[model samples]
Target: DPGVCCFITKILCAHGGRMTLEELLGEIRLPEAQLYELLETAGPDRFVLLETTRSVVATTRARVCRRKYCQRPCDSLHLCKLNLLGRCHYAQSQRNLCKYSHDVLSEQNFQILKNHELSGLNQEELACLLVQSDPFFLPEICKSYKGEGRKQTCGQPQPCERLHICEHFTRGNCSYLNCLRSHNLMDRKVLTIMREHGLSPDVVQNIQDICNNKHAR
Candidate 1:
């Protein structure tokens, strides 16, 4: 029923929006498969997301924030994040994924947080905003995840056509001033996601070194 739909919307909005398929079942009287199917069916309206085993993020879906990195679709947000970061979670979350550390929430979040102020962000979310303020931090992290190329030999450090980071974009400054990039844009985009989720930056660097070496092969 649409009433049920309204209830789900309110619940999601109440509890920071995002929720698991498993959790959603417990709250509603609907059976397991039916509710997920309902959610999957209803998701096209933009009231919710149809994710594959993920969070429900109770923030707005509208493109409302003014922060350079807080936009949706993840890529433009920088920091190599693949998940929805800012508004979906948007200054409202149990995980605290959508809040700023600054005093003025609007100034930080571009006036997104109307209910609660900034919240505690997870590593992925944290990396999202941080890269905006300090754009160069991304290259420092991605120092791995290379393009197809030859292995190093004869004391050569291997040719990396993929290894170009915007020099102006590093050192805590960037030229694009937005997600826009031309050459090797995808090169530096692999770090934060690879780093925050499972592998540490140095660990990823080591793995890249190994992938670079292939000496075991």
Candidate 2:
């Protein structure tokens, strides 16, 4: 319930504007069946889910920081307005957590690659490396959970439109170009290994194109 409460608080802070429960539900992708129960436990007045308007809105809290001043590091001497604002901003930006998760995954992948045996590079290693070194990797990996990677759409109603915007795409907040370069280099080595095992050039090219285009976007 704390997690739910925290999530709701974050949502309130992020929008800085009112939203109907319909809007919040769409944005957060929470299951409808559990929405009322979650909100009731978080705080009765924390949200106003208007049935007539089909919207949810958060009331202003004196303790909550505004978005502009939310995330600044705490300072004992100063008012720390920035830190206050940042906490609110963070709660609102649910995608921020997803971004952090991506960062953690990138670190894990990088470590794996760094420790990989040069002579032991195999098909699985090649696949793993390709995924790790590309900005499009996470989205592509997410595809496996749904179906075809590129063609698949997010099932959530309020999917972040940014997911479709390549300009905003990143692997752990790093540029797609950088990640692509690493992927390209590692993939070449992988291709060599695959070739030795009689893998087809066309197949490699196709897969490489998929990753490349996804990142390029």
Candidate 3:
């Protein structure tokens, strides 16, 4: 659509924003002028940031470099049968940042999506399930990430003194933010509870044992 290499620049910008001169050579056969010109048209300033040769061109922009790629505007990956990788980087890049979409994909989330055991699920469905349904509130996020919301142990359980216990842990849905209580029992304490409760000591026998040197997770 835009010049061939120029269009391709949009793709490169989409992938990671940082590319080596060697990388561009892999896709573009033309002299580097078009890309620089394309970038020039995209924004202002020194336009396509590039590094020059020997003492003949030692006055290069210190921030952006050449042969090593200039900083890109985007930093997310896009995969689609929808339109040649979103039919132009700018359009796709914008789509990638949907309000309901995840800001960045976690490697754990990434690998889990590809596991063969999950092959039966649709990619779209998997993505929806893995990401935050309520803006940055990932279901898998541990309590540590939420910054101990509004701590005020006015009437908390004793175990919660040095621990986190979710009011919803004993139920189905966590009211979130509103119900301020520890979300789970301490691992070691939990093991002890299991030993006392109906949950046989054998199941958690290997879960924790400072003396035996065993640790689960």
Candidate 4:
């Protein structure tokens, strides 16, 4: 049923877009085979299977620009600087063929941007925020920072756009005075969803601390 599918998606989103197969299996009563088939029906635009980890992962449908080296659609919390400056020529010429987003908002992102506090962000910043805070989207992790620890520098010789830390931060309206999560108006908007479905302060503090430690490194 669509309702069941929606519910599953919600859970996945809440968990930062990836959950172990067993973790998901615990939420609903279904045989593994049946659930696997259901996830298949959910489609690549929404979910993917990590065969090595036996996990279910959720993803957004938005295309990211590869040509301009914009990680905004992948691992960033800000719009592609080029797009913001009206200089993302690749998006202009390629249109549908371009993998990068030329616009300020996707459907999921629009919902978050409509609120007043987030109004401060222009189109480019909005796009960046969407990629960063949206749970259904997964940013690739840099191999150099593969483990739980954050390295002082990206070990890769070439530029690396992948994220150095695991996802998840406190939701909007951060209570922490020095929170990295709510640093910008964009982050405040993203965390509004957290206000409605917040994790325990304990969990959020852990996440915030983890994020802080990474930045400090």
Candidate 5:
């Protein structure tokens, strides 16, 4: 399944695009037998292995020298060898499993995916759109919060005071976090532009405080 695909891809990418059998297995918590079976099914052409070695020299000379004339020299060289391997193991496995097909991805394709993942919408615009689009959206989100049950904490029936209203409404899906963060970043950019334009200190502070609170939680 593609369940393990993304995690495997991340691990391989982290290890300079390669890993030893032991290294790959160690990074992900899975039984050796199952992992082996998965790899075997993934086909041999998907990976490459190469022999690698390094040589180092060691010396002992200075210890004998209480005086420069008394010094003795002993130098030794040693070589270390390792088998280096690389694979798009996750992609290969996914292809075999039909979780993801083997298709050449272009720059345009990548940009399209990124754009969909990280939307171009501003926070205020997106928030307003959401509030307007979904009638029960905000209220339902706030209701999910345990805090909403405590009416004493909420002095009034304002939208923020309602636990589920704010929670479900503003909390949004996982993607929302990225959207909010990006929006805050854009907001900061706007603030910088404003400061350059000679906006008042009080106005800047107020906007900064609002942005800070929104970004924080």
Candidate 6:
């Protein structure tokens, strides 16, 4: 793996490719010669390197169409996961600068998705599309939920968005205040999206039943 090269690319991409050489050096831990050599080797294909000018450093090459590049034909195109959850700090701070497409209906993605019945999909279908088959697509489970012998406390500095209640909550029987993982699936953003799409009460109950069956194990 080209660790250093990828690291430089990530930082530059995050900042919209506007970092000064000096600023980049400050964040990087590598020797100046080694760093310069990697940058030089990467050349124009990976970056547009410049000298002495803070105004111009390196920018990523053209953004490729995700569908054409890495996606399977069966995959349903949707907004970036973070963007859909309202948790994408990058989009919130610099919407246009984010590498991920905020618009699910952009021409490229739409072209692919429309062919896969995107136009006629109902609320449940849309939620399934957005979430795929991932079991933990809602507000995430806390990283520390399993360790520390059922006494986990998330140590993240920023307030964690994940739930720290009992895993059994997904089974619909976790009623403890200190149950160690989150059980509040009702207020999740997916449900909100489904409700916004004008779902029937039966559809809402369907989602609940589906989740319960999956977790009952």
Give the winner by lDDT.
6
> Lowest lDDT 10-mer window, candidate 6?
55-64
Between candidates 2 and 4, the TM-score winner: 4
User: Cα lDDT of all candidates, in order?
Assistant: 0.37, 0.37, 0.31, 0.45, 0.31, 0.47
Count of clashes in candidate 6? 8
Best prediction by TM-score: 6
Off by over 4 Å in 2: 1-5, 60-217
Model 2 scores a C-alpha lDDT of: 0.37
Quick one: ranking by TM-score, best first?
Answer: 6, 4, 1, 2, 5, 3
lDDT string for model 5 (16-115, tens) is 3345666767776688776666555532222222232311111111011122232223221111000001123553343444222123122322333232
Clashes of 3: 7
Backbone collisions counted per model: 8, 16, 7, 7, 10, 8
Looking at candidate 2, the ten consecutive residues that score lowest on lDDT are 74-83
lDDT of 6 by residue, 68-90 (tens): 45555434454565555455677
For residues 107-164, write the lDDT of model 4, one tens digit per residue: 5344333331243344534433334334323334334543333354674577555444
C-alpha lDDT (0 to 100) for residue 182 of candidate 5: 25
Candidate 1 Cα errors over 4 Å, as ranges: 1-5, 13-17, 44-61, 65-217
Where does model 3 exceed 4 Å of error? 1-6, 44-217
Residue lDDT tens for model 3, 1-217: 1112233433333333224454564566656676455444643211123332200000101111112332344222223212211223443575554422232233423333233122233343333222201111111223433334664543244433222344243222454544455444335654454434323333222111211111110
In model 5, the Cα lDDT at residue 125 comes to: 26
Candidates 3 and 5 compared: the better one by TM-score is 5
**Candidate 1 TM-score over all chains jointly:** 0.28
- Model 1's alpha-carbon lDDT is 0.37
